[PDB]
Amino acid sequence: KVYNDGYDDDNYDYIVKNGEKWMDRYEIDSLIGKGSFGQVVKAYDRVEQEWVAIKIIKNKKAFLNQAQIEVRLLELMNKHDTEMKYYIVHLKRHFMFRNHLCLVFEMLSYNLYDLLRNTNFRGVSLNLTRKFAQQMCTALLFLATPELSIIHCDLKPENILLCNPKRSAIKIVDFGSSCQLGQRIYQYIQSRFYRSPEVLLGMPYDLAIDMWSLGCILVEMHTGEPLFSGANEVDQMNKIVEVLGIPPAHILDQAPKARKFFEKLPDGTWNLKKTEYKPPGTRKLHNILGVETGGPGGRRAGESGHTVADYLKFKDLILRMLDYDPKTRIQPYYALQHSFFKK
Template identity: 70%
Template sequence: MLTKFPKLFSSRYQECSKDYSFSLPHFDTNAPPASLMVVPSIPEGEDSRNRQKGGPHNGGYDDKNNDYILKDGECFNARYIILTEKPIGKGSFGQVTRAYDTVAKEDVAIKIIKNKKTFFDQAQIEIKLLEMMRAHDTERKYNVVLLKGHFVHRNHLCLVFELLSYNLYDLLRNTNFRGVSLNLTRKFAQQLTKTLLFLSSPELSIIHCDLKPENVLLCNPKRSKINIIDFGSSCQIGHRIYQYIQSRFYRSPEVLLGIAYDTKIDMWSLGCILVEMHTGEPLFAGSSELDQMMKIVEVLGMPPKELLDIGPKTHKYFGKTEDGVYYCKTTRDNFNKCYRGPGHRKLHDILGVTSGGPNGRRAGESGHSVEEYSKFKDLVKRMLTYDPKARISPYYAVRHPFLRPRTTSHSGQPAASDSPTTKMSYQLKHFYTFIDFFKIGRCSPVVIRPSSVVFPTDFRWRDQNKETSSSELWLRVQSRVHWLKCLSQVRVVAFAEINSVFFSFRRTSSEPLELLKDVSR
C-alpha cells in the first residue's frame, strides 16, 4: 500500500481539491466540543463515487451497525486521505483508521464515532477531557495520547490522534503469552503510575475507567515508551456517568459491588495489568461478574466486612449468616466445583517470588532476584487492596522501591541517591511510617492562620536540640501549603517552598510533634 501511496495520494488529492469552491479550512485544535467544525468531504452532486445508492443507513454511507463505510483514498475534511478500507481498530464506539494528513504531512489515526447520539455525546466528553489533559501537559510528560483535532464527517464525529504502534496485548502475544521481563514490566509501571498521578491531580480528577493492555500503546515498536489511549469511557470525579465500567478482567471490587468509585479503580486495573505483563496471563480471568469476584477472592481472600456492608450488589456474590459473617455463595451453594476457596491461590506463587519467576521461567536471569520479586509483589499487593481508601495512591506508587531507578557508582556500590541515609529516602521513610497523604493542591500560595493547626508546646526540630515556637515555624514555612489533611485526632501538614520542604505531623499517641527540616536540600 505504501509503495503505491505517492501516486494514489496525488490523484486522490487532486480529485478532492479541484472540486472545492472554498479554501482549505482552518483546523481548530482548541475549539470546544460545542463548536465542532463540519466540512463536507466531497462537494454536493459529486458523491456518487462513494455512496451506496438507496442505502438505508445515513444515505448509504453507514453499515447496519452505524459505522462509516471506509473507502480507500477518500478525503476527509479536505485534509486527510484514508489509507485503507480496513480499520486498524474497532470497538463499541466505532472504528479507528489510518490516514495521511496533507497539511502536517504525517500519518495519523482517526477515530470515527458511530452515527448514534449516545456515542456522539460521549465522544464530546472525551474531547473535553483530552483537551484538558493537553492543556495541563504541554511538555508531553505524562504518557497520554495526543488529540490533534476533531471534526464532523457525514454525521460522524472524528477525532484525530497521533499514530502509535501496537498495544501491550499484542506485545504479550508476541511473547507467546510467556510475559515480558521484570525490568520491562518496571518501565511500563513507572510510566503508568506517573500517568495516574497526573490524572488524579486536583486540576483534572479524571478516571480512565477502562485501563487494560489493549489501551496502552507503544510509541515505537523498538522502545519502551508508551501512551494511554481510549478515554471514551472516562469521566471526572463528581461527574460519573456509568455504573457498568471497566473491562471485566480489570474491574475493581468497588465497581463489582456497586459502590461509588473514584480514581483508585484505575490503580486496581494497573495492578492486574502489571501481573499479566510479567506472567503472560490475566490475574483474574472471570467468565462473568460472579466468576470474576470469585477469582479475586481466590487470590486475595474475603473482602473486608465494612466494604461488603455498603455494597448494593454484595448479595450477588456473598451470603450472610445469622451471626453477620459473609461467605461466598459458590462455597455454600456449590455453584462452581472448580472454585478452590478464599486465598487458595497465593500471589507469592503466581509471581514465583522464590521459585525463579512465573513457572520458574526467569530462574537465574539478571534482574529477577528474590529481592526484586519481593518488591514487585509488595507493590502489586498495595495496588490490589480491597478498600479503595487503603489502596496505594499514585503519589506513593511512583515512589515505591520497586519503581525507583537503580544506579551504581564506579565502585559498584549503590550511588548516593539510592542510600537510605539520603535526605529524600529519609523523607519517604518517615512518610511511610505514619500516614498516607491526600494531595489537594500543588504548592499554591494561600493565606492560612497558625491557629488552624494545633502545635504542642514541647515539639522540637528533629535535628536540633532546641525548642521552636509556632510563630517561628510559620515564618520559616512562609505560608505555602503543599498537603493538608485532617483526620480524627490526627492533623497532618506539609509545607513547600521553592528551595526547601518542611513536613510536620502529630501522631495519635502522646509522642511530640516531629519536624523534618529541609529534607529536600
C-alpha cells in the first residue's frame, strides 16, 4: 500500500532517508535509536549551527498523545531557574513535519548500557560510578521539586546518556514513560531488573521507586552485571530476597501481590512459596561488591580510591537506596550528603 503519501512505512514510522533536508533547516544524518514510540535521528541544525537529536513520533493518535505529555513535562522542567535541570536532557523545540511530532533535543553521546558493553560487562571504576551517582542524585533532587514531583518510572542504563564521550557528565532521557505523582493509574511499570518491591507487591508508590532503580543501576555500573536479573516477576523478587532477605511483615501484610511470591504460615510469619536460590539475605552486597577482596572479581585490587573504607561508604549508600520501606528509603537531598560524595 501507500502510507502517508509514501513517507511512512506500514508501522506508522517515518522512513528515514540520510541526507534529507527538512524545512530548509535540519540536515538528517542517520538513525541512532528506535522504539515503540517511533525513531530518534541524528541531524544538523543549519540555523543554530549545531548537531541535534530529533525524536520522530509515530503518525498515530496513541503515540502522539504520549509524546505530548513528554513535551509538557520537559517544558514544565525548563521553566525552573536552577542549574540542576541540566542533568535532564534539554528539549530545545518541537514541531509537526509530515504528520509526525518531532521533539528536538541536544545531541548526547552513548548511554550507560553501551558503556557496560565496552567493558565486556565488567563495570567501570568506583571513581566514575561515584560521579554518575552524584549526578543522578541531583537529577532526582530536581525531579523531587514540589511543583514537578515527576517519577521518571523507567530508569535504567539505556536511559542515562553521556553528554560527551570524553567526559563523565550525564543526562536522563525519555520522559514518555513517566508516572507523575498522584492518583495511581499504572501498576505494571518500570523495566523488570530495576522494578521496586512496592511495584512488585502491587502497593502504592511514589518518587522513591526511581531511587530503588538507581541503587540497582549504580551496583551494575561497577560490577558490570545487573544486580537483580529476574527473567520474570517471581524470579525478580527471589533475586531481591537473596540479597536483602524477606521483606518486612508490616509491608507484606498490606501487599495485594504478597501471595504471588510469599506464603503466610500458621505462626504469622511470611516465607518464600517455592517454585534455585540462596537462602534469604545470604547473597551479601558486601560480597557482591567485593568490599574486602579488591572489588568485583578482584579486578580493582590496588586501584586508587578502591580501599576497603571507600567500598563501605558505597555499600552503605546503596543499602539505603534499597531499603524495603519507601518511606525511610534515602531521599535525594540526604543521599547527596553521604560520605561517599564527601571531599
